[PDB]
Amino acid sequence: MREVISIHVGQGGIQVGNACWELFCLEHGIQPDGQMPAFNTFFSETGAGKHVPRAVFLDLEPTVIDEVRTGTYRQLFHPEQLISGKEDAANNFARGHYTIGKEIVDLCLDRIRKLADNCTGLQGFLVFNSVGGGTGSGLGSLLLERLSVDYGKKSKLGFTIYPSPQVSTAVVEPYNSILSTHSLLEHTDVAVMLDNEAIYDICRRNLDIERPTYTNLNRLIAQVISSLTASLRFDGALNVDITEFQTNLVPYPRIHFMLSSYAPIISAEKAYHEQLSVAEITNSAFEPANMMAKCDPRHGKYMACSMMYRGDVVPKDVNASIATIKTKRTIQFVDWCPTGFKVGINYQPPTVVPGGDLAKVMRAVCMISNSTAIAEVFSRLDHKFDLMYAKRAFVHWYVGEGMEEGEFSEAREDLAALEKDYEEVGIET
Amino acid sequence: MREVISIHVGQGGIQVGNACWELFCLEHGIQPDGQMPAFNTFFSETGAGKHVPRAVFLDLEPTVIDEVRTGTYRQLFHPEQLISGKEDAANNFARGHYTIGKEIVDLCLDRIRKLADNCTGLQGFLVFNSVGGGTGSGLGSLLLERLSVDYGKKSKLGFTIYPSPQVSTAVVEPYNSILSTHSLLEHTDVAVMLDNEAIYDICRRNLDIERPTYTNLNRLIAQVISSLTASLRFDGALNVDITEFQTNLVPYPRIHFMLSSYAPIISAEKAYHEQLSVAEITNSAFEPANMMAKCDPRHGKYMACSMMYRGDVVPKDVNASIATIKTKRTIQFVDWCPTGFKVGINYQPPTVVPGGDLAKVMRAVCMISNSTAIAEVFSRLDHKFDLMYAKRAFVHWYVGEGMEEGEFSEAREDLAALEKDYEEVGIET
Amino acid sequence: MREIVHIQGGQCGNQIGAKFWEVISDEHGIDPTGTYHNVYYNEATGGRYVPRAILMDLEPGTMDSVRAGPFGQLFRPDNFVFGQTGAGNNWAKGHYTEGAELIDSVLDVVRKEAEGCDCLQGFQITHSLGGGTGSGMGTLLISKVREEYPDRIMETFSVVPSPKVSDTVVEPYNATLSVHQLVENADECMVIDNEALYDICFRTLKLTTPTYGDLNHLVSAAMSGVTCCLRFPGQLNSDLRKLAVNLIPFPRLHFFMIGFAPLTSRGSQQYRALTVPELTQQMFDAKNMMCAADPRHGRYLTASALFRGRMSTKEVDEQMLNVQNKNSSYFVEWIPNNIKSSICDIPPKGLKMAVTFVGNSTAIQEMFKRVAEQFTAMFRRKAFLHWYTGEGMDEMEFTEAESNMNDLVSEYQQYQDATA
Amino acid sequence: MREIVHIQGGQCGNQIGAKFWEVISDEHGIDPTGTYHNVYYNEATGGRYVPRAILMDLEPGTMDSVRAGPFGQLFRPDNFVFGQTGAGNNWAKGHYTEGAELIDSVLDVVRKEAEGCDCLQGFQITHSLGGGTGSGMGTLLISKVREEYPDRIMETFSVVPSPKVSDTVVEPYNATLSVHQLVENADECMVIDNEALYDICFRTLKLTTPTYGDLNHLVSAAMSGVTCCLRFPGQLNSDLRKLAVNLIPFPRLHFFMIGFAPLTSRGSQQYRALTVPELTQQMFDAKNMMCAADPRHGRYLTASALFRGRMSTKEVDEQMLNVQNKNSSYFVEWIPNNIKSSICDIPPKGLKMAVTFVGNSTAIQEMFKRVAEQFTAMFRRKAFLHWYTGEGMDEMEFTEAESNMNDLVSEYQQYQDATA
Amino acid sequence: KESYFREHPHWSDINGCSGAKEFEGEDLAYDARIKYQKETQKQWIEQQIREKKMREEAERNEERAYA
């Protein structure tokens, strides 16, 4: 009667989705063999034994799909829900949005149409794409437009990985990210901005893992998304809906860029020393260090915080801990939202994955905040773009695929519009 | 619903705190590894079997923190409370208060915030440090500043190991010790002046040992502090909170520099050949020979005396002996405070640390005196200070680190005013 | 999928190609008999793996020299199309007369190899800039194929004249005649010089008796490591085109320096550790690169680093950040995060780590300065010209070629200084 | 954490460093293989431990002198910077022309050794002062690295001209040339003479065949005892900088004296006990210091006594107070309690006590006075000047050097007379 | 969803009363509940540590092999 579709386009989102489906199959008892020895939100039934997950795995570079097409989990998916191309986007936009996308996005549309007519109470989409690669940017924009004009009414939530403040794995990041901002604003109703250096620091100081890797980050993101969809999947003493997320967190059609946080991200050793109550966990869930986007919440001003819990919890504990939180002086809200803390409870504790540095623990919180500090992030990225566009750097690589030059300035002013809004709403009366 | 935060900074502070936690974990039946085969003040429950102490250990030289991490109590603490720097303090001030201390102050404040929220009935702090050192003064000053501007009402209990008259372990100790008075007045409520030479002599005469060591030093200091906090932790006919001191020992909040005394400090064989009643013990308490600071109160007056008698002691005997001691001629009070002796009783005796030189005693009395003689100490120290600053000795090692030299005389001005203020309260009206 | 055609040319190109196929064989586990005990090879009925290549030269002696050495049986007996008369190191010999009478069949067999694939991602050339055969027929074949396949990419692993000594005293003329046509129709000009490889095999390996086999083995390791993050899995994969965008900001400034790591002798191998710090230090080491231009005397427009081995990533990123925030002066600042990283999941056979470094810097402009200097000197005296006009070529071309060269360096130095 | 990069220079520095690494390896229980059975050594593949020491010279014979000796195979050959020409006992040779156009490689390897650390604290050099290569390259390296890394500190264990009987005939020239480069670019400079070492080894240990090995052993033991309170636990731990702050009142009165205790022969050890009053009685003795300048002819601006082993700190403090209040003349007054103490918690290998005395006295000025004589008596006749002039040395510099030296000794002359 | 289904852990049987006498406040066993919960979590952490130690030791084994 209700389910979610999750798309994993690109090479980043697809690794995140690999880890995510790993964790999901682990928690619902679904063995990697499909045949198992509350889950209708994710997995459907192919009439016999094996439960097929709802997702499409798009990537033009067929390397990672071949990692999963013959890896440990190839028994699970549908061999048509693994779409691969024969080249890359080479990190530029138009080649993943004008020339090569033209062939593949139509097939993606047909497959998503089939998955839609298969399911009955679909409630939301979840695209998984970094904006660093030309795939996740151009393919992302094109598929987002195609869906927002095909389905429409349904909400959208993109777990998009941006380029970090200072570190990068590509030198042409500011270009093929700004061009996706136009797509992200209109068609992508919400956007759960994720970064890497934040989770890097989290791993480097919380879980004591000195030499982290992409798989650790992906396991953690998988845990976050499981915590998000807990209320839909599992039992709950006090539930929340994926439609209720939107109206509780979208004050205006053009300020909806939300960041996230999760707790307790604590290794085995340190868990031996922690109060473990709801008070300290919803206290640490507000510190800046464990905000999964490298921003400074001490500077901005929150607008609306939703909190999906899990594990045994007495609601009066949540009420008293939120009283203590709102009592803390250094944190401040806007005038037009005196009630900004939405709660939601579920009765499934975290799940452990063999090899996951997360210590098993009953209580767990996951916060998602629409705040106005995130604007600085955008502004930060803006700086990069400046010091490129003055010299038309790398521009011919874009014009060589049918993309008009002026698009860069247009998307630049489009993002300057956001840098105007997100520092216009956080103003007194 | 009672608790205190025990911040230990510097080098002497952290070893004194190590011995103090030894004594505490001992007397409460706690095992040094944390488990247990009346403690909510210091130790707290850790959500897994054992208990952890309310303490944070700041230091820059990793040697002492490493020794604690590899000593006996490695499993006791929380591997976050042990904040270790990267270099040494080099026995100057600006390198722990202006340039480097800013690396660790914010992390310390976050940890202290965590400890504060994990507690309900806060009652005060207990900072232990020297000032002849480099970080025990600088980082201590910065922490006092940040706390006084962050928490406010909660009163701080400084335990500062000053330089003794003749014994010296540094040549620049007057400089950085004077550099701490500019912040000891403002942000600190109670300051228990502790020297070393007096305690060395104490260990020589009473305990009969002729090769004393810093470990015995810290054992005695730990004993004094445990006898101080027994009233919070345990039973007693006349309990005395830590908000009693402010009302009983602080005439004017600008003159709050107390000095300690303890009894009975006796070896094994020197208790066999004695009686050791309450009267003799309260005579021995006031004897400047076994006072825990370098001062001869015969050349001063007494503003107030908080006495805490732990062990099996009846109150009427205390009252009678108090009358006698106040009737003596050589121990004279000020006129403007006729009723000076505040007294409290606890029904628990001392709990000797295993392997100590002291003897088990059915009774004990710990006196903390706000007196007027301690002033001369400050005066003496200024003497030393001048004989250096008259020739600009070592000013380069401070000006090299942004420390505006004009502060120095200011301190030697401000502290100088202190002396005048004491000459304002010694006025027999 | 995403194949690679192996065009050769010149005796240097042929030797380096033989060594490169040797390395690819004993990495992919192909014994020199052609069995296993699509990116490069081609399945062949009977259970063989014939390497997709082509060998061109005006002397059929290199034929027997390359078939004599091991791993020569891999190359099919049909690709060995060779000319007869020989060019004798005369650009016009290998670019106008012998070119226009054998390059026809060269293009024919190249097309035959091309259509046989499904996605010919890019080309691959092994040749020289000095010899008439190598330089001439190579630039002509490159012009022809780039008129043929305007969609694919180009790359030439070209050896250039060493600064100290020269191999063929007319090196400047053939060099400039190859660069005047290469700069227009080529994307990845991986420059190498014999002196840098000499200094590498002596200083950093203590090998006292280097032979062209060993030097070709080193350049083989470099060429392999270039793309090895493609035919293998990896936590972050790249290809021969993500490089191109992460490397060239402009249609001209696309001439790359090359470096490999790790390399150490017998003695110093017992002591030194092996972690991302040491690999980075050898990566950005001045002498470790294979270019006769110390990069410290310029800057980098950009640089990429393809690691190999199952290792961490935070070390990678934090050391990129460190090497960019400490050596910022020697980097250029009008571009953000001017370095790019890539990671694979298989190190070379016999280690647990590897690094292949590629750099689009502004330090080879000095090399082009010295080449233009040599050209002007040997040109104002018309030295050695009647060979270059007795074969249907006017001096005019020569002149304009140098002009083009000027413009090239006229760009590089410029972007070295301009800021915003 | 708080590492140290040790350097040498000249045969004096190299030999002292050899014996010093021997003593250090003895302390941490290592064998010449370099395996155990961060401050000094570096971990290495297979559990090895390689010293963090750069050795440098222009005479490659001293390498074969130190490498062939025991505890020699440790040092990694990637650090033996040995120019293959020569030095010839001349300052300008080893600082301007010959021993200077090599310093670039030394900087590169020092940078490789430094940027690979986490929190480097200070440099620790050992070298002579009349030795051409030693003094010259030492002061050039000092200038370079101190202009390069000001965050860290500097410490040099120099040796001085043996005052009574010389060892070279041009020692004053290079000695004062080095002095003029030290006071401007250093932060700690301990001095040692090869004369007082003889009087010690002859009247304190009753030796008969003291080879330079044993004297270097004594000096190296002192050097290890200086910084032993950092790599080991301690009731009151010190470091390199705690000295650098508790000692030097002004940025130039930074030339210390070194003393080790205890040191006893056969019978003298048979008779005397090991109790810290005795160690103090032996520590302050003028015949127990490594500097041929009887401190009785001056005073102590300050003196740090670093103990080792395990002892009641009350005994240490009582001995300090008694020796300070009883010899109230030999100490200066305007710095109250001018003696500093420190206690580590590890005895040497084979005792139960140990004492290192690092004393900034105002009595070593006398030594410099004699140099101010010799140089002056070797300049009005322009003796031996043309060799230094033959390398571009401008005599003007020489002049100011002497002038600088003047101020230095003059500084001390202003303070032992100061009253308050 | 299936909201309001557990009240971790609750839903007693038919039995009850109409007034207000018993409300299962404190569950009459809250203290033993907390004690057993703490013991279970300590067991979990002990097991996780016992596993992480071996997973780490595998790395030193690999290092010896590489040397």
Ligand SMILES: Nc1nc2c(ncn2[C@@H]2O[C@H](COP(=O)(O)OP(=O)(O)OP(=O)(O)O)[C@@H](O)[C@H]2O)c(=O)[nH]1
């Ligand atoms: N946190 C995290 N980031 C990842 C992961 N995998 C890839 N990324 C990031 O993906 C970004 C690159 O964008 P991609 O879309 O993957 O590059 P691409 O797929 O090669 O793009 P084209 O080949 O040109 O189509 C890099 O910044 C990676 O850090 C992962 O598993 N976890």
Ligand SMILES: Nc1nc2c(ncn2[C@@H]2O[C@H](COP(=O)(O)OP(=O)(O)OP(=O)(O)O)[C@@H](O)[C@H]2O)c(=O)[nH]1
């Ligand atoms: N009562 C007591 N005093 C101590 C102890 N340990 C050190 N001290 C005092 O510490 C003072 C030395 O200054 P330090 O605190 O060590 O210097 P610092 O500020 O910590 O800076 P660094 O030690 O260089 O990192 C001496 O005066 C000692 O009296 C102890 O265990 N007990």
Ligand SMILES: Nc1nc2c(ncn2[C@@H]2O[C@H](COP(=O)(O)OP(=O)(O)O)[C@@H](O)[C@H]2O)c(=O)[nH]1
């Ligand atoms: N690194 C390396 N360079 C080579 C090798 N063989 C030739 N070269 C260079 O090839 C250059 C001559 O170009 P080439 O076209 O091969 O001569 P041609 O056959 O007469 O036309 C010379 O500068 C040689 O140094 C080799 O085996 N290894």
Ligand SMILES: Nc1nc2c(ncn2[C@@H]2O[C@H](COP(=O)(O)OP(=O)(O)O)[C@@H](O)[C@H]2O)c(=O)[nH]1
């Ligand atoms: N105690 C000791 N002193 C040495 C040793 N080697 C050299 N010296 C001193 O070195 C001084 C001569 O200068 P030196 O550095 O050896 O000349 P250079 O090395 O050729 O530049 C002499 O005064 C020697 O006393 C040694 O091994 N032990």
Ligand SMILES: [Mg+2]
């Ligand atoms: Mg891709």
Ligand SMILES: [Mg+2]
């Ligand atoms: Mg300190």
